[PDB]
């Protein structure tokens, strides 16, 4: 049994980017995605409607610039055997700190923590817990980085194994990487 989750965030349409990269839209076809977890900063209803055309279950958290202030600050969604924590990450002091995120993984009692304010992609296992920072799909700028690479994560969950396919657009080519995670 395969469950597909699209980990996305920091689109910043149209505050910092007009749209997603050209190739990503071609790759993201409707029907192949079951859940969509967004770290936030879509900033418009248009990106939310675009996500609604890609899957049925669409969980979005509040960014630091999202227009809809009713999106939850943090969320816990159970897909397969895995509980996943979703938060934008700008609450975290400092941004992207390991301990400051382990605190959230303790609070939520959660298996995967997704947080993406720092637009650089990351994926690390700390204290037998999985942390994914999917980066910015549109490559939106931040003061923290010089060369932002558009990226998004796609988790295939089956029983206890999550295979994470990470899509990054370098130059004009979409590289994909495989990350293996197994819950003890």
């Amino acid at each position: 049994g395969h469950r597909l989750v699209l980990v996305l965030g920091d689109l910043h349409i149209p505050h910092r980017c007009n749209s997603l990269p050209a190739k990503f839209k071609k790759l993201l076809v409707p029907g192949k995605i079951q859940h969509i977890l967004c770290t936030g900063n879509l900033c418009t209803k248009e990106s939310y409607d675009y996500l609604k055309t890609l899957a049925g279950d669409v969980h979005i958290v509040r960014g630091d610039f999202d227009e809809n202030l009713n999106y939850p600050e943090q969320k816990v969604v159970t897909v397969g055997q895995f509980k996943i924590g979703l938060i934008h990450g700008h609450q975290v002091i400092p941004w992207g700190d390991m301990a400051s995120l382990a605190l959230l993984q303790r609070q939520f009692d959660v298996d995967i923590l997704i947080s993406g304010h720092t637009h650089k992609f990351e994926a690390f296992e700390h204290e037998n817990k999985f942390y994914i920072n999917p980066g910015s799909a549109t490559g939106a700028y931040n003061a923290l980085e010089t060369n932002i690479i558009p990226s998004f994560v796609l988790m295939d969950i089956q029983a206890s194994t999550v295979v994470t396919y990470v899509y990054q657009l370098i130059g004009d080519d979409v590289k994909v990487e495989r990350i293996e995670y197994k819950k003890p």
Binding site: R62, H90, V92, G96, K175, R178
Partner: protein
């Protein structure tokens, strides 16, 4: 009084050890996604343009249409119509791109600001697009600014500084001060970044209890907590101007939050103090977790000088003293639920950042754990 110490953190080594090794995919390998009053005419024109012009252009007729549409805004204009008009004008603005001619783009934006003054969302989009323009100039000239574009990026930052106060939204104002300050601080405009941060701090004491959200009045406590957390995370990179005391903006924000009018039935102020512990502990390290391209943050500016580290430690001790005072007042208030909640949060903070090797902080942590378990 229990002092504080910072657990040494080697962010490079920690990330290197805990990072998951990904195996790249070659072609063939499987990845899942492998195959005047007649505003109606103005709306009709703008809809056609936004729906059937998908490439940027290098205006006057569309500008006149937008002026006619925007001039209809008065005291009798509803919020829904203002939202629609702002959407249409932003759709017009998005497609006007002068490419590598940055100066003409900024001229277009200043003209737009002088033309669409009433509709706030257009102004927000203009600030965001000017910030994008400055960052795009940085990206094109690869950080190594030329003498010519230094003035241009300073002009963009000044445009943000003068335009943000014209907004009415309190939290939009705070977040745009913070973001525009970060944008300025990515282009070696230290003095204007400090002004942006000071403006945000000075504007913090104005946020009320109830804020408008989709037409409904909701408490602003959680939103203020989020903004203050964002600001504290931002202050890690900000250089300290030598003409002031150490951690000047951090201390100013702490004073502001100390004097802020918090609700009597509220304990979020102590939560924010618990958060300040995080920022100080991170700021006390040898090299900071994240940096700007060429701005000497306090990590290299002070170089971890014993005086600066001691000042950070003393500020940590003061914040902890405040938190412990509130905890004791909670015990005297007999509402033990909030006491246990804050004790859990504080113990978690100490475990996250505090140097547990030190006996004095360890005893405080053990006492906090036992206090939390003493009342479920």
């Amino acid at each position: 009084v229990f002092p504080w110490h910072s657990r040494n953190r080697n962010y490079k080594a920690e990330f290197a050890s805990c990072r998951l090794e990904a195996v790249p995919l070659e072609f063939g390998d499987y990845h899942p996604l492998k195959p005047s009053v007649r505003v109606e005419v103005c709306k009709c024109i703008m809809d056609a343009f936004i729906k059937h012009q998908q490439e940027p252009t290098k205006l006057n007729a569309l500008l006149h249409v937008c002026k006619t549409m925007h001039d209809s805004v008065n005291a009798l204009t509803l919020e829904d119509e203002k939202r629609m008009l702002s959407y249409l004008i932003n759709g017009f603005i998005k497609m006007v791109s002068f490419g590598r001619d940055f100066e003409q783009q900024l001229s277009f934006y200043v003209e737009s600001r002088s033309m669409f003054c009433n509709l706030e969302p257009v102004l927000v989009q203009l600030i965001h697009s000017v910030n994008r323009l400055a960052m795009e100039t940085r990206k094109v000239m690869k950080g190594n600014h030329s003498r010519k574009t230094a003035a241009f990026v300073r002009a963009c930052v000044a445009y943000c500084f003068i335009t943000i106060p014209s907004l009415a939204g309190i939290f939009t104002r705070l977040n745009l001060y913070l973001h525009s300050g970060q944008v300025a601080l990515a282009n070696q405009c230290l003095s204007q970044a400090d002004a942006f941060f000071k403006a945000a701090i000075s504007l913090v004491p104005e946020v009320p209890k109830m804020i408008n959200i989709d037409g409904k009045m909701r408490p602003s406590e959680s939103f203020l907590l989020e903004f203050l957390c964002n600001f504290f995370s931002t202050l890690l990179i900000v250089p300290d101007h030598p003409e002031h005391g150490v951690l000047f903006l951090v201390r100013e924000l702490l004073n502001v939050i100390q004097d802020y009018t918090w609700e009597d039935n509220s304990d979020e102020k102590i939560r924010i103090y618990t958060c300040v512990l995080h920022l100080l502990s991170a700021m006390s390290q040898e090299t900071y977790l994240y940096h700007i391209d060429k701005v000497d943050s306090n990590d290299s500016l002070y170089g971890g000088d014993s005086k600066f580290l001691a000042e950070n430690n003393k500020l940590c001790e003061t914040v902890m003293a405040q938190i412990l005072e509130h905890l004791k007042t909670l015990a005297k208030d007999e509402a033990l639920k909030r006491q246990s909640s804050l004790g859990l949060s504080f113990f978690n903070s100490i475990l996250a950042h505090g140097d547990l090797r030190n006996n004095k902080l360890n005893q405080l942590s053990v006492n906090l754990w036992h206090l939390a378990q003493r009342h479920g």
